[PDB]
Design a protein around this ligand. Structure first.
Ligand SMILES: C[C@H](CS)C(=O)N1CCc2ccccc2[C@@H]1C(=O)O
Ligand SMILES: [Zn+2]
Ligand SMILES: [Zn+2]
Length: 229
């Protein structure tokens, strides 16, 4: 199931949904996978998260051209860290409209990232303000609260069993929540539970640093975050 294309891996999760995976050495910790999503909506393609680098992100676009051969209408990126936004210039070079949380766009320069072209904002209960996410089709964007970072957002795919927790959610066997330097340890647990509650029909939880898991990833993440309060 893991289709290799250059240095990336693509895995079909549903008839119109694929996981993209790219790798970057984090010295002393290995070649770390980061996952995002590709969704076909009719005659166009939507991307969730870049790869770590421009070159890897251009490879995503080349895979899409070969395996889907439809235009990429937009991309949404889920926080201002390199695994999610490191390939912004490649998306812009391809003419793809890009979207991020307004706070991610604000943070991008200090994080060494190129900002997305458009900013998403969110209602008090986390759902995206629809005028800021035009043409998102089946992508349902939700801000669960601060957790892994203050800007982290999540995305469900309507018409599927899939929701994407990004780097907020760890798998059900993870030993910890990882680096907490940008994290909000007071609010993380509630944000993890809010993601679960936003997407109650998503039995397949996709996340950035582990393979797709059951909803036990959400409960385990929440329980780990409870430990930190
Ligand atoms: C660059 C990304 C942005 S989320 C990052 O910081 N990661 C990625 C996953 C990983 C794996 C091994 C060691 C550290 C990390 C670290 C973390 O989450 O702690
Ligand atoms: Zn991150
Ligand atoms: Zn990450």
């Amino acid at each position: 199931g893991d289709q290799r294309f250059g240095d990336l891996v693509f895995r079909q999760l549903a008839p119109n949904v694929w996981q993209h995976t790219s790798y970057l050495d984090m010295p002393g910790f290995g070649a770390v996978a980061s996952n995002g999503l590709i969704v076909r909506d009719g005659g166009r393609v939507l991307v969730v998260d870049t790869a770590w680098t421009d070159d890897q992100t251009a490879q995503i676009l080349n895979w899409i051209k070969q395996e889907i051969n439809l235009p990429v209408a937009l991309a949404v990126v889920t926080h201002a860290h390199q695994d999610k936004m490191g390939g912004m210039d490649a998306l812009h070079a391809a003419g793809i409209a890009t979207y991020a949380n307004a706070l991610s766009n604000q943070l991008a320069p200090q994080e060494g990232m190129v900002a997305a072209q458009h900013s998403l904002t969110f209602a008090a209960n986390g759902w995206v303000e629809p005028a800021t996410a035009p043409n998102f089709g089946p992508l349902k964007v939700f801000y669960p609260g601060p957790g892994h970072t203050s800007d982290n957002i999540t995305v469900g795919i309507d018409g599927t069993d899939i929701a994407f927790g990004g780097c907020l959610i760890k798998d059900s066997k993870a030993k910890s929540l990882g680096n907490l330097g940008d994290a909000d340890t007071e609010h993380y647990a509630a944000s993890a539970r809010a993601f679960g509650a936003a997407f109650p029909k998503a039995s397949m939880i996709v996340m950035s640093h582990s393979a797709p898991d059951s909803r036990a990833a959400i409960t385990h993440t929440a329980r780990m975050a409870d430990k930190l309060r």
